[PDB]
């Protein structure tokens, strides 16, 4: 899953 600040 993408990191919290990735999107």
């Amino acid at each position, epitope marked *: 899953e*993408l*990191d919290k*600040w*990735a999107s």
Partner: antibody
Amino acid sequence: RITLKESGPPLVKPTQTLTLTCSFSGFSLSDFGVGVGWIRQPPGKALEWLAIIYSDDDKRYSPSLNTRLTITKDTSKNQVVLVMTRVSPVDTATYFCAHRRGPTTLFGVPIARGPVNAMDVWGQGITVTISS
Amino acid sequence: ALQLTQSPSSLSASVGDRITITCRASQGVTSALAWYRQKPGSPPQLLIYDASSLESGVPSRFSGSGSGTEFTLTISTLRPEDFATYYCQQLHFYPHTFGGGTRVDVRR
């Protein structure tokens, strides 16, 4: 100005529940985007990521340990707790809690995310042994 | 999970020397990569964040670069306190993961 300190039992028996507490100062877990994570280091091995919890109560766990880990925060007491159930000697290691910066803000407005890409401050760590 | 491979696993060097450690990810992690230094009996310490940014208080001899799947950490002039183990960490994907570490010892 940021300090983290881990506390818990130095020895636990297999099948028991391990409870670790991270007490910190220098920052609030109520600050935008800030996070606190746990990382372990088994004897003579590499670092292993366990979980992280953020100011907005969002939280994530290492998938392989998902069912045994639970992380919670207490903003009022400046503490983060990690609970691990059904421990085994495989869990023997030094456990560290660490701070993760939230995005940089200008007058309260998020401007850059770069500083979140790291765990900038780590506690001294606590060594926990699981054995009967 | 995302695999991080550090190389070399072990490195021999002398004070004053220039060394470079590489980290390779199984897939792109953009610039979400950090480097830490760890001395025996102590916790990891942040050197570089976001692939190339120098953490405040860290000596200018440390530098980092790269993006995507290839990153490097460099110490221009090695110091006595630099003989330790170094680790990379990616924070682009959950779970965050660390490389296997790189130990730097005294050459002879």
